[PDB]
Every structure is written in C-alpha cells, then in structure tokens.
DNA sequence: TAGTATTACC
C-alpha cells in the first residue's frame, strides 16, 4: 500500500501551498522535481511534480507533505521520464537529488 | 484511496 514513487498535480496553487512544498526537507527524497505549468493562454496554473521518496510513503502521508488539494498517483514511469515531463514548460520550482534507476 | 481538475509520468 505505501509506495516509494509518486507523481502529483496541484491546480491553481496559492503562495502558501507553493511555500509548503518549497520548504520540504531535501532529506525526504531520492529525487524530487516540481515545475510551474499552465501559465499560458486560457489555461490553469498548476504544479507538475514527481517525488521519489527515500522511504515508501502512504497515500495520506504523501498528501500531508504535498497538500490536501493535490491529485497524486503511484508513478508508473521512470525518474528520468518524470524529470523530462515536469521540466517541459521551463519554469522549475525545485529539483533535488538525481533520477534513480 | 481524495482533491483538483482536463492537469496527471508509462
Ligand atoms: Mn502540466
């Protein structure tokens, strides 16, 4: 049930929610990336994220760390694929660690 | 899994 690797989307993040995530300790993660997306024409600003935790984490622990309003899923793709997907719009909020095999 | 949404990796 608890799982090491999760993606997340957070739609219309507020400055508070961005700070919560910004302020996460980097010791929590083997790899973590968060991109700001959805800022272009007629479209929803959101965080596009991926977390590879040091330890496996339950669904509700992940929501505690990242925020109540996040949509989260067990990651099916590799760290590298997620790194590319969450970097695709060119405005990264944070990235720490390195992608893992 | 719940929450926010059409954004969400393979
Ligand atoms: Mn996106």
Residue numbers in the entry: 12 to 112
Question: What does the report in the manuscript say about this coordinate set?
Answer:
We present structures of two 10-mer bound structures of inactive PCV2Y96F (1.93 Å resolution) and WDVY106F (1.80 Å resolution), and one 8-mer bound WDVY106F (2.61 Å resolution) structure. The pre-cleavage state was captured by mutating the catalytic tyrosine to phenylalanine. All three structures are in complex with the divalent cofactor manganese. Additionally, the catalytic tyrosine (though a Phe mutant in the structures) is positioned for nucleophilic attack of the scissile phosphate, where the active oxygen of PCV2 and WDV is measured at 2.2 and 2.9 Å from the phosphate, respectively. Strikingly, despite the absence of bases that make up the hairpin stem in the short target DNA oligos, the ssDNA is bent into a ‘U-shaped’ architecture like one might expect in the context of the hairpin loop. The U-shaped DNA sits in a shallow channel on the surface of one face of the Rep protein with a distinct topological ‘nose’ that juts out in the center of the U. The bent conformation of the ssDNA in the Rep structures is driven by both intermolecular interactions with the topological ‘nose’ of the protein and by intramolecular Watson–Crick base pairing between T−4 and A+1 along with adjacent hydrogen bonding between N3 of T−1 and N3 of A−3. The consecutive stretch of 9–10 residues in the turn-β4-turn structural motif (‘ARCHIEKAKG’ for PCV2 and ‘HPNIQAAKD’ for WDV) has two critical functions in the structure. First, it acts as a ‘bridge’ between 5′ and 3′ ends of the nonanucleotide sequence contacting positions −6, −5, +1 and +2.
Replication initiator proteins (Reps) from the HUH-endonuclease superfamily process specific single-stranded DNA (ssDNA) sequences to initiate rolling circle/hairpin replication in viruses, such as crop ravaging geminiviruses and human disease causing parvoviruses. At the heart of DNA processing of all HUH-endonucleases is a structurally defined catalytic nickase domain that first recognizes a specific sequence/structure of DNA; nicks ssDNA at a ‘nic site’ to yield a sequestered 5′ end that remains covalently bound to the HUH endonuclease and a free 3′OH that can be used as a primer for DNA replication; and finally, facilitates a strand transfer reaction to resolve the covalent intermediate. To uncover the ssDNA recognition mechanism of Reps and identify potential motifs that might confer sequence specificity, we solved the first high resolution crystal structures of two Rep nickase domains from Porcine circovirus 2 (PCV2) and Wheat dwarf virus (WDV) with 12% sequence identity, bound to ssDNA encoding minimal sequences comprising the respective origin of replication (ori) sequences. With this, we term this turn-β-turn structural motif as the ‘single-stranded DNA Bridging Motif’ (sDBM), and suggest that it is the main binding moiety responsible for recognition and conformation priming of ssDNA by Rep HUH-endonucleases.
